[PDB]
Structures are given as structure tokens and as C-alpha cells.
């Protein structure tokens, strides 16, 4: 799975958040701008065969699934040291 820009997702979330009057933090991003990307990217996982068995009610045996993520981030002026990057 490829997220074409997770900088623009952060900007759209900042919009939705400021329109709800929520106090902003650094660079005017909300407090939970970390949790936004954390709970997303933490799903790109690899899971052992017991999880696949239990989830699929025993239809699939011995295989392990996975989801590989390549998020893309855009950095202004080569700054790898800004709040969202």
C-alpha cells in the first residue's frame, strides 16, 4: 500500500481541527497529529499463522499475511527536521 502524500493528509486534518476550534501546537498542527499517522501506519504489519487461523475461523492454515506500506512525505527545502517529517 502506498500513501501518495501523508503531508497533505496532515494538512487536511489540521484544517478539520482548526475549524473545530481545537488549540494547535507546534507549526499549528493539532496535538494528536502524531496519533493520526501512528494509528494508520501501525496497521502495516505481518501476522503469524495463529492469528490468520483464528481470524478466518480456521479456513486458512499455516500461511502468514502481511501489509507493506510506503508512505510518501514532502519536505520543504531539504529540512528533515520539521514537526511532521
Amino acid at each position: 500500500i502506498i500513501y501518495d502524500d501523508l503531508s497533505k493528509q496532515a494538512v487536511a486534518y489540521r484544517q478539520i481541527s482548526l475549524l473545530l476550534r481545537r488549540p494547535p501546537g507546534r507549526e499549528a498542527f493539532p496535538g494528536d497529529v502524531f496519533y493520526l499517522h501512528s494509528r494508520l501506519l501501525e496497521r502495516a504489519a505481518r501476522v503469524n499463522a495463529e492469528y490468520v487461523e483464528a481470524f478466518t475461523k480456521g479456513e486458512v492454515k499455516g500461511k502468514t499475511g502481511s501489509l507493506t506500506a510506503l508512505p510518501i512525505i514532502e519536505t520543504q527545502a531539504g529540512d528533515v527536521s520539521a514537526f511532521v517529517p
Binding site: 488549540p23 494547535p24 507549526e27 499549528a28 527545502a77 529540512d79
Partner: protein, 284 residues
């Protein structure tokens, strides 16, 4: 940090870039003048060497000490160095080459001896502990032969007095504007050119009063002239080196402004954001 400190630093770096640009211009003009003063010096040495060539080992010859390769028990060096810094690696490349060769000579058990032109070498070899016996300093960009008479007098006197057995001048050689090379080269005993005055068979000089007294002064004046030419080439090389050093320094200042300005813009944005957020989210 903060917009004001970074803006002050950007201002100071721009000022530095101004200064180094000016020093590059000045060094270029002085390089031109010094490599004219260099070319003006050739005819004297070039004709005096032909005189000595005819008189010393031509169709007749003499037995002056400065012409014979006697046994080396110790060596003397004349070292040309700048009086001014910011010349790049010039002086240190030269001094490292000199130390590398003096190392060999002292390994063989022969001592070494030094006479210094310019103050940079004076300070350096005082710091290393070399044996310096005569020096002249503060010639700046106005070298004159009447100042070189002392230190070369010391070395000639010590040569024919038997206290040296070989004499070198160590100096930089101005080759091309972008390239200069350090060289150690010998000037006693006289190195043997391939010029053939066998064609001069057709004549000989009238000597007033006699040839033996004339060959001596010709050789001394020739050594003094070659030392002067070395000084002047080293001066043109100092200028051609400071020019490129200051060009590089101006480009480095320019490449540093472009980073300070990114830091500055980031600080400006952060300050606007923090102030405006404090106001708005403080109210109500």
C-alpha cells in the same frame, strides 16, 4: 537563534564576502605587477651566465672554488617565504619539502644551515628548532637586491671559508596562474648548462686588470642575482596563491549565506506562528 541573531549573522557573512572579493581583486593586480617585475630581471642573469660560461669552462678555464664538486660535510639553504598570511598552502608545502630533504642530509651525518628571507619562515623554523644564522624580513611587496646582500654574503663567506660544501635556494616557482610548485635547486657549486661556447673559439677577452679577479666578482654577482630572481618569483607566486584562496573563500561565504537564510526563514515563520497562536488561543 531567533530571527534577529540570524539576521545579524547573515549581515556579517555578507560583509566578509565583500572583504574577500576585494582581496581577490587586489591580489590579481599585484600578481600582474609582480610578474612584470619578474620578467624585467632576466637579461642581467642571462647575459652574466654567458660571460661566466665563456670565462670558466670555455676554450680556456680556471680553478675557482665555486666550480668544483668537493666533499659534502654540511649544507646551507636560503629559504624564501612570504611576509603575509592568507596565501594558502604555499609556505607549508615548501617547508615540508625542505624538512624532508634536510632529514636525508642529517641522516647522512652532514649538518644543515639556514638563512631566511621573509618572516613566516623565520617564525616557523624557530618553532621547529632549525639552525638559522641570518635573516632579512619585512621586504613586503618591494624586494630590492640591496637588502639581499647581507644574508647571501653570510652564506658565500661561509662557503669559501670552507664551512659549507653545498648551497641551495629553496623557493616556489610561478608556472601558470593556477599552478605553482615548490623547488629546491642548487646554486653552489655552479650547475653545468649545455650551452656550448665552442663557437666562441673565434675570440677571447681583454682582461682589465686580469681574469682571475673578474671571475670572482662575476660569480658572486650571479649568485646574488639568482637569489633575487627566486625572491621575485616567490612574490608573484604568493600573489597568485592568495588570489585563488580568496576566490574560494568568497564562494564559501556565498554557499554559507544560502544555509543561514533557510535557518532564518524557518525562525521567522515559527515566531509568527507562536505569537499569533498565543494571542488567539489566549482570548476567550
Amino acid at each position: 537563534a531567533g530571527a534577529k541573531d540570524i539576521r545579524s549573522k547573515i549581515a556579517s557573512v555578507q560583509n566578509t564576502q565583500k572583504i574577500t572579493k576585494a582581496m581577490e581583486m587586489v591580489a590579481a593586480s599585484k600578481m600582474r605587477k609582480s610578474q612584470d617585475r619578474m620578467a624585467a630581471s632576466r637579461p642581467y642573469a642571462e647575459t652574466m651566465r654567458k660571460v661566466i660560461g665563456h670565462l670558466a669552462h670555455g676554450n680556456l678555464e680556471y680553478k675557482h672554488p665555486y666550480l668544483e664538486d668537493r666533499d659534502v660535510k654540511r649544507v646551507g639553504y636560503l629559504v624564501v617565504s612570504t611576509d603575509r598570511g592568507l596565501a594558502g598552502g604555499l609556505n607549508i608545502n615548501l617547508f615540508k619539502k625542505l624538512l624532508a630533504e634536510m632529514k636525508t642530509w642529517t641522516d647522512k651525518g652532514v649538518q644543515a644551515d639556514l638563512a631566511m628571507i621573509g618572516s613566516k619562515g623565520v617564525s616557523f623554523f624557530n618553532s621547529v628548532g632549525g639552525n638559522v644564522v641570518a635573516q632579512v624580513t619585512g621586504m613586503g611587496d618591494n624586494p630590492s637586491l640591496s637588502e639581499l646582500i647581507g644574508p647571501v654574503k653570510v652564506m658565500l663567506q661561509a662557503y669559501d671559508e670552507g664551512r659549507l660544501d653545498k648551497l641551495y635556494i629553496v623557493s616556489n616557482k610561478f608556472i601558470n596562474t593556477m599552478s605553482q610548485v615548490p623547488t629546491i635547486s642548487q646554486l653552489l657549486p655552479l650547475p653545468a648548462s649545455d650551452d656550448d661556447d665552442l663557437k666562441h673559439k673565434s675570440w677571447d677577452y681583454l682582461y682589465e686588470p686580469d681574469p682571475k679577479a673578474l671571475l670572482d666578482t662575476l660569480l658572486r654577482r650571479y649568485v646574488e642575482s639568482q637569489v633575487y630572481q627566486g625572491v621575485v618569483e616567490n612574490l608573484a607566486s604568493e600573489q597568485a596563491a592568495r588570489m585563488v584562496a580568496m576566490k574560494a573563500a568568497t564562494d564559501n561565504g556565498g554557499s554559507l549565506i544560502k544555509e543561514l537564510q533557510l535557518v532564518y526563514n524557518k525562525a521567522r515563520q515559527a515566531s509568527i506562528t507562536q505569537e499569533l497562536t498565543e494571542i488567539v488561543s489566549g482570548a476567550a
